[PDB]
Amino acid sequence: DKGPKPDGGKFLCFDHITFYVGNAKQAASYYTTRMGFTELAYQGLETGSRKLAKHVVRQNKIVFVFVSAYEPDNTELGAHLVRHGDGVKDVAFTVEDLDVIVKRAKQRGAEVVRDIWEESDEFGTVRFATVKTYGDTQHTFVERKNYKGLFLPGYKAPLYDDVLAKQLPATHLDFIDHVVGNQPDLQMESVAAWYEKVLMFHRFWSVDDSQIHTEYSALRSIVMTNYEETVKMPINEPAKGKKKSQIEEYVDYYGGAGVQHIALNTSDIITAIENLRARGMHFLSVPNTYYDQLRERLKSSKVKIQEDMDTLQKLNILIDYDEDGYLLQIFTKNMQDRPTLFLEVIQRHGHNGFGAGNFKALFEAIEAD
Amino acid sequence: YTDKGPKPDGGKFLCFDHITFYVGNAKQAASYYTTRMGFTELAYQGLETGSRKLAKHVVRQNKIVFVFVSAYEPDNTELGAHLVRHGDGVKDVAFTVEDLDVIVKRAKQRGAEVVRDIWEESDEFGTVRFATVKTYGDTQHTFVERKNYKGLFLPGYKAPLYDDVLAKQLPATHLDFIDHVVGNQPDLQMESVAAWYEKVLMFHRFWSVDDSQIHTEYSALRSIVMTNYEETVKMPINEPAKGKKKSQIEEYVDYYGGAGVQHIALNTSDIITAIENLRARGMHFLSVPNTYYDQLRERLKSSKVKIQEDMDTLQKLNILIDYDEDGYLLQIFTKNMQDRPTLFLEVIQRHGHNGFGAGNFKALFEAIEADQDK
Numbered sequence: 220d221k222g223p224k225p226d227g228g229k230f231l232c233f234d235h236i237t238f239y240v241g242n243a244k245q246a247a248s249y250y251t252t253r254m255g256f257t258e259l260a261y262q263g264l265e266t267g268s269r270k271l272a273k274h275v276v277r278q279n280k281i282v283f284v285f286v287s288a289y290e291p292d293n294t295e296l297g298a299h300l301v302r303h304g305d306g307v308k309d310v311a312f313t314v315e316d317l318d319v320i321v322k323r324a325k326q327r328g329a330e331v332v333r334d335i336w337e338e339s340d341e342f343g344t345v346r347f348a349t350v351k352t353y354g355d356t357q358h359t360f361v362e363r364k365n366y367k368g369l370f371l372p373g374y375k376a377p378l379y380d381d382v383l384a385k386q387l388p389a390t391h392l393d394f395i396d397h398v399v400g401n402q403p404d405l406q407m408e409s410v411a412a413w414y415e416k417v418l419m420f421h422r423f424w425s426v427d428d429s430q431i432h433t434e435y436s437a438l439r440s441i442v443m444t445n446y447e448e449t450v451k452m453p454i455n456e457p458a459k460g461k462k463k464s465q466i467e468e469y470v471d472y473y474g475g476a477g478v479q480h481i482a483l484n485t486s487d488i489i490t491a492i493e494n495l496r497a498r499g500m501h502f503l504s505v506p507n508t509y510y511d512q513l514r515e516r517l518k519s520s521k522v523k524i525q526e527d528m529d530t531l532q533k534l535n536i537l538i539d540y541d542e543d544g545y546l547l548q549i550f551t552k553n554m555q556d557r558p559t560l561f562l563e564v565i566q567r568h569g570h571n572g573f574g575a576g577n578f579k580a581l582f583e584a585i586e587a588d
Numbered sequence: 589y590t591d592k593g594p595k596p597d598g599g600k601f602l603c604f605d606h607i608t609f610y611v612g613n614a615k616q617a618a619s620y621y622t623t624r625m626g627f628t629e630l631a632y633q634g635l636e637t638g639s640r641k642l643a644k645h646v647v648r649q650n651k652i653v654f655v656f657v658s659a660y661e662p663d664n665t666e667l668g669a670h671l672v673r674h675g676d677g678v679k680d681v682a683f684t685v686e687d688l689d690v691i692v693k694r695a696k697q698r699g700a701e702v703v704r705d706i707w708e709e710s711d712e713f714g715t716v717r718f719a720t721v722k723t724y725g726d727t728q729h730t731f732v733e734r735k736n737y738k739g740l741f742l743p744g745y746k747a748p749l750y751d752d753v754l755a756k757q758l759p760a761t762h763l764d765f766i767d768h769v770v771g772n773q774p775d776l777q778m779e780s781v782a783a784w785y786e787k788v789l790m791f792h793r794f795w796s797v798d799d800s801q802i803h804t805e806y807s808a809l810r811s812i813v814m815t816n817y818e819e820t821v822k823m824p825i826n827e828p829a830k831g832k833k834k835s836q837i838e839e840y841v842d843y844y845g846g847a848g849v850q851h852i853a854l855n856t857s858d859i860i861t862a863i864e865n866l867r868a869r870g871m872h873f874l875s876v877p878n879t880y881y882d883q884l885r886e887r888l889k890s891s892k893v894k895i896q897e898d899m900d901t902l903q904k905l906n907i908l909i910d911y912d913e914d915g916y917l918l919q920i921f922t923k924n925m926q927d928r929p930t931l932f933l934e935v936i937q938r939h940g941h942n943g944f945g946a947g948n949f950k951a952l953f954e955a956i957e958a959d960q961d962k
C-alpha cells in the first residue's frame with residue numbers, strides 16, 4: 220500500500236546534495252581525495268559568480284556541491300556555518316512536471332525559498348524551485364529533462380586538473396541510496412507528515428519496521444519515500460535506550476535538525492572499502508566478537524553470503540540479513556570534528572532494509588568488549 | 589654589520605613556534621595540508637581528549653608546525669565571527685621565546701592589548717608558559733616559553749586518533765622552516781603596524797636589497813620588514829599603494845574583511861624536488877610564461893651570479909628567480925588556500941640572498957605583457 224497515487228509530478232532520483240561549508244575548495248579536495256569523487260564543475264569569481272564559490276564533485280551518479288561565501292559577513296551562509304559547522308544545506312531531487320509538484324507543495328503549505336525559475340546556456344534549459352524542509356535544510360526540485368551540459372547551466376569545467384585524485388584507486392560508489400535526517404525530540408512524526416502531505420511521499424515499510432530495536436538504537440525512525448520508491452528519506456528522533464542516544468548528540472552539536480548521513484550504494488563493497496582505506500578514510504571500530512556471533516547465527520540461516528567473509532571481517536564491513544537476502548554496510552568516521560555528519564557505503568543483495576539488526580549486534584560486541 | 593637599534597635588555601624571540609588557523613573544518617583542513625602540502629598530522633586535542641569546546645589538529649613538516657582549530661558547539665561567538673568575517677585564515681603567529689616575563693612586561697608597558705595574560709599548562713612531559721597579545725587585525729601573537737618541553741607539541745596534546753596511510757605514502761616535499769610571514773594592512777596602516785613591532789616587541793626594520801629598489805608601479809604596495817634583534821623571525825608588513833593595476837593588497841583587505849596574514853613562506857634546500865613532489869600531490873602554482881625565462885636569461889648575461897639549479901627544470905616547474913651580484917633566491921607561490929582571494933603559500937630557497945623577490949614584480953608583469961602582445 221503506497222497510498223494515493225499523485226496526480227502528476229514525479230521525483231525521479233536524487234539530483235545532487237549541496238553542502239554549506241567554511242572552505243569549499245578544501246572540502247571538494249577532501250571528498251575527491253578521501254572518498255573517490257572527481258571535481259566536475261565550478262562557479263566562482265572566474266565565471267562571474269561574485270558572491271558564492273561552488274565546487275561540484277561527482278562519483279558515477281553521486282553529485283555533491285560545496286558552497287562558500289566570497290565576501291565578509293554573508294549573513295545567511297555565515298549563520299548556517301556558525302550554527303552547524305560544515306553540513307548539508309540542500310537535498311535536491313530530479314523531477315518531472317515541476318509545475319505540478321510546486322503548485323501542490325505551495326497549496327499544501329510548503330515554505331517557498333525560491334519560486335520557479337530557469338537558467339539557460341548553449342546546452343539547453345533547466346527549471347528549478349526550492350522549498351524548506353526540516354531545520355535549515357531545503358529541497359530544490361530540478362527539472363533537468365535531458366540537459367546536455369556539464370552539470371547545470373552556468374557551471375564551467377574545473378580551472379585545474381588534480382593529478383593526485385587521478386592516480387588514486389577508484390572506489391566504485393554508484394548512487395545515493397538514502398539520506399537520513401535527525402530531528403529533535405518529538406518531531407519525527409510531524410516531519411514525516413510533512414513529506415506525506417506536501418510532497419505526497421508515503422511511509423516505506425521494510426524488514427526493519429517489523430522488529431523494534433529501541434533499546435539498542437536509542438531512536439525512532441520512519442522512512443518516507445516517493446510513490447515509485449526511487450528516493451528514500453529516513454527521519455529519526457531520539458528515544459530512550461540502554462545508552463545515550465546518538466540522535467540527541469547530533470541535535471546538540473548540530474544546533475537543530477539536519478542530515479546525519481548520506482548512504483552511497485556500491486556493487487563491490489570489498490573493493491570500495493579497500494580503496495577507501497587506501498585513501499586514508501577510517502570507519503567504525505568493529506570488535507571481532509561481532510564476526511564470531513554472525514557466522515554462528517548464520518548457521519541456523521539459509522541465506523548464502525556471496526562475499527568472502529574473512530575479508531568482510533578484516534575490513535570491518537557489517538552484515539544484516541533475513542531469510543530472503545542481506546545487505547552489506549559500513550560507516551565512515553565523521554566528515555568533521557563535530558559529532559554530526561558521516562557517510563555510509565551499502566550494498567544490497569535482495570534486501571530493502573537499512574541494517575537495524577546491527578543495532579543490537581554491534582551494541583553487544585562493544586559492551587562485551 | 590647593520591644598525592639593529594637598541595639591544596633588548598632581556599627576552600629573546602627564538603623562532604616561529606607554530607601558526608594557528610581558525611577554520612570551518614579543522615579535520616578537513618589538516619587533511620588538505622598533509623595531503624597537498626607535505627605535512628604529517630602530529631597531535632590532536634578534541635572531545636576524545638577532554639577538550640570539549642575546541643578541536644585542534646596539529647600538523648608538522650620538519651620545523652613547520654600548523655595548528656587547525658574549529659569550534660565544537662553552535663554559536664561559538666569568537667570563532668564564529670572570525671569565520672564569517674575572514675573565511676579560513678591565520679589567527680595566531682606564535683613565537684618560541686626566552687624570558688617570557690620580561691618580554692610580556694615590556695609589551696604590556698608599551699601598550700600591547702593583552703588577549704590572555706601569562707598562564708601555564710603542564711602534563712607528564714613538563715610545563716610551558718604562555719602569553720597572548722593582539723597584533724594587526726584579528727591576528728594575535730602567543731609567546732611560547734617552550735624551554736625544552738619533551739611532549740609531542742604542547743601540554744595536553746595527544747597522538748592523532750588514526751594514522752593516515754595516504755599522507756604516509758605521498759612523496760616528501762622537503763620544506764624545513766618558516767622563512768617569513770606577511771601581513772596585509774588596509775590603506776595607510778603600514779607605518780603604524782611596523783611601529784608597533786619596534787615599540788612593543790623591540791623588533792627593528794630589516795633592510796634588504798628589496799628596500800633599495802623602486803617597485804611600487806609594478807607591486808602596487810609599500811612594504812616594511814620587521815625582525816627581532818637576532819633576525820631569526822621576519823614579519824613583512826604590506827599596505828596598498830597606487831600602481832599600474834589594482835592592488836592585490838587592497839583586494840586581500842576587501843575579501844578578508846580587514847588586516848591579516850597574506851602568505852607564509854616555507855624555506856627549502858631542494859626546491860626542485862619540493863615543487864616536483866608538491867605538484868605530484870596535485871598542488872598548483874602561479875602560471876609563469878616562457879617569456880619570463882627568456883628575459884631572465886638575457887638579464888643574467890650581464891651578471892656574475894652562478895645559478896646552481898638546472899634552469900630548464902626551473903622553467904618547467906615555473907619557479908621564479910631573483911638575484912643580485914652576490915647571490916640569488918628561488919621562489920614560487922601556490923594558488924590560494926581557499927576560494928576567497930586571500931591567503932596563499934610560498935616556497936623559497938636562498939643562495940646568499942636576503943631579499944623577498946621584489947625584482948619579480950617587474951619581471952613577471954613584463955613577461956606576461958610580452959606573452960600576450962606576441
Ligand SMILES: CCN1c2cc(C(=O)c3cnn(C)c3O)ccc2N(C)S1(=O)=O
Pocket residue numbers: 397399427440442453482503550563573574575577578579581582
Ligand atoms: C553509524 C550509526 N550506526 C547505524 C546506522 C544505520 C543506518 O544507516 C540506518 C538504520 N536505519 N536507517 C533508516 C538507516 O539509514 C544501521 C545500524 C547502525 N549501527 C549498528 S550504528 O550505531 O553503528
Ligand SMILES: CCN1c2cc(C(=O)c3cnn(C)c3O)ccc2N(C)S1(=O)=O
Pocket residue numbers: 768770811813824874921934944945946948949950952953
Ligand atoms: C604572489 C604575489 N606575488 C609576489 C609575492 C612576493 C613576496 O613574497 C614578497 C615581496 N615582498 N615581500 C616582503 C615578500 O614576502 C615577491 C614577488 C611577487 N610577484 C611578482 S607576485 O605578484 O607573483
Ligand SMILES: [Co+2]
Pocket residue numbers: 397399480482563573
Ligand atoms: Co543508513
Ligand SMILES: [Co+2]
Pocket residue numbers: 768770851853934944
Ligand atoms: Co614572501
